[PDB]
Amino acid sequence: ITGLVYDQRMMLHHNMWDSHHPELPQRISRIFSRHEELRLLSRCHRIPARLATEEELALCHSSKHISIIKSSEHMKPRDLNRLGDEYNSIFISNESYTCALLAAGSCFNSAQAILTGQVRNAVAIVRPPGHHAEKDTACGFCFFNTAALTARYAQSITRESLRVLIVDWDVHHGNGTQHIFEEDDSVLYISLHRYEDGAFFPNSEDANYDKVGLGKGRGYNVNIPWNGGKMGDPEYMAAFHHLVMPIAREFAPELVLVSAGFDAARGDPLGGFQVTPEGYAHLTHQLMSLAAGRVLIILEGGYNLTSISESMSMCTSMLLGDSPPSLDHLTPLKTSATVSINNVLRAHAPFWSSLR
Ligand SMILES: Cc1cc(C)cc(C(=O)N(CC(=O)NC2CCCCC2)Cc2ccc(C(=O)NO)cc2)c1
Ligand SMILES: [K+]
Numbered sequence: 001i002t003g004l005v006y007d008q009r010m011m012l013h014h015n016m017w018d019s020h021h022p023e024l025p026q027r028i029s030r031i032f033s034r035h036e037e038l039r040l041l042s043r044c045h046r047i048p049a050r051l052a053t054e055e056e057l058a059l060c061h062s063s064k065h066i067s068i069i070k071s072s073e074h075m076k077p078r079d080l081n082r083l084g085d086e087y088n089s090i091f092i093s094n095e096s097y098t099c100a101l102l103a104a105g106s107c108f109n110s111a112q113a114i115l116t117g118q119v120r121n122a123v124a125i126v127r128p129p130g131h132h133a134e135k136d137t138a139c140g141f142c143f144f145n146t147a148a149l150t151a152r153y154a155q156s157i158t159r160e161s162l163r164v165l166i167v168d169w170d171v172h173h174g175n176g177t178q179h180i181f182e183e184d185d186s187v188l189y190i191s192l193h194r195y196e197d198g199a200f201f202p203n204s205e206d207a208n209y210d211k212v213g214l215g216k217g218r219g220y221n222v223n224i225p226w227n228g229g230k231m232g233d234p235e236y237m238a239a240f241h242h243l244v245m246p247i248a249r250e251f252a253p254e255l256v257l258v259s260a261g262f263d264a265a266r267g268d269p270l271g272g273f274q275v276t277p278e279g280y281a282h283l284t285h286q287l288m289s290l291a292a293g294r295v296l297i298i299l300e301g302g303y304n305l306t307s308i309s310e311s312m313s314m315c316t317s318m319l320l321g322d323s324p325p326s327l328d329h330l331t332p333l334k335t336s337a338t339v340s341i342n343n344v345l346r347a348h349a350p351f352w353s354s355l356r
């Protein structure tokens with residue numbers, strides 16, 4: 001029923017100059033170990049990992065960007081150090097390119113397994129993350145945009161115009177995913193992210209609510225930016241009820257990809273929010289009502305090892321069919337959260353009749 005892909009070879013990507021960098025190899029092994037402790041692994045169908053090909057990376061990335069990252073596979077440490085400093089917040093090791101290939105190819109196999117009907121949904125415990133990677137550059141711990149590539153891969157084996165919904169609940173804006181699909185009406189990108197008027201990473205006004213897409217893509221980019229607050233379950237539930245789910249139902253996606261960063265969880269040193277594991281489980285179960293249940297959960301950020309292990313395991317439990325948790329929908333929101341939601345409603349009401 002539920003697929004799961006994990007490969008410890010993705011642990012080889014590491015930071016040679018700061019072993020305490022929070023994007024640790026143990027991120028994925030701790031999540032995998034938690035699935036075993038909770039006896040969820042044996043309930044899933046193990047999907048094998050594989051390398052994405054260079055032709056598949058070219059679905060979203062330029063040949064120059066593919067070539068440069070590929071060239072790092074055999075660089076000396078001094079060259080890996082210099083190459084990394086040419087990007088915003090990037091460390092590179094000799095294994096980084098292969099791990100990025102394995103992360104993308106693992107989601108390709110997961111999407112294919114969903115599209116053949118072999119599994120109903122799937123989880124991908126992969127690293128390095130992807131949603132900060134742009135067409136021509138790496139950024140924010142990301143080399144290739146795994147979620148964006150998986151969307152294009154799905155279209156390449158079913159129908160070119162297959163309607164794919166990408167929900168990005170990582171605490172950071174997926175600037176790479178937004179730009180790749182900004183003019184595309186076949187891929188709806190909805191991102192919830194801490195914004196702080198543009199001061200939170202990645203420090204760009206591209207993440208604001210008035211960025212709704214370009215050309216034919218107008219209305220197919222939904223930014224839900226949080227400002228001046230410590231958001232948690234009530235704010236994310238309200239955004240799904242008023243924004244994500246009404247838009248997603250009207251879009252009627254045929255496939256749902258979740259850029260699932262868990263750095264908005266309580267205790268995360270980079271996020272500062274307090275979304276609980278039950279909150280992530282509620283969001284997952286909501287998305288399962290779409291696309292006849294065809295949901296692929298792809299790991300992005302998340303850096304409290306205990307928090308991400310519990311949170312993603314709760315999402316897998318939901319995909320396996322376990323009963324969703326009960327949450328108080330009457331809890332009052334932070335006042336700035338209501339302002340954020342109303343700003344998004346005003347910006348997207350001219351494009352979605354479900355908001356009018
Ligand atoms: C180079 C570096 C390393 C580490 C471990 C963290 C950070 C960091 O503090 N950052 C967020 C931030 O506010 N930087 C400001 C920008 C304005 C001027 C001064 C610092 C970067 C970052 C990138 C990606 C992700 C992610 O992918 N999360 O899922 C998280 C953090 C930098
Ligand atoms: K996000």
Ligand SMILES: [K+]
Pocket residue numbers: 181182183184185187188189213217220221
């Ligand atoms: K779009």
Ligand SMILES: [Zn+2]
Pocket residue numbers: 170171172261263300301302
């Ligand atoms: Zn993040």
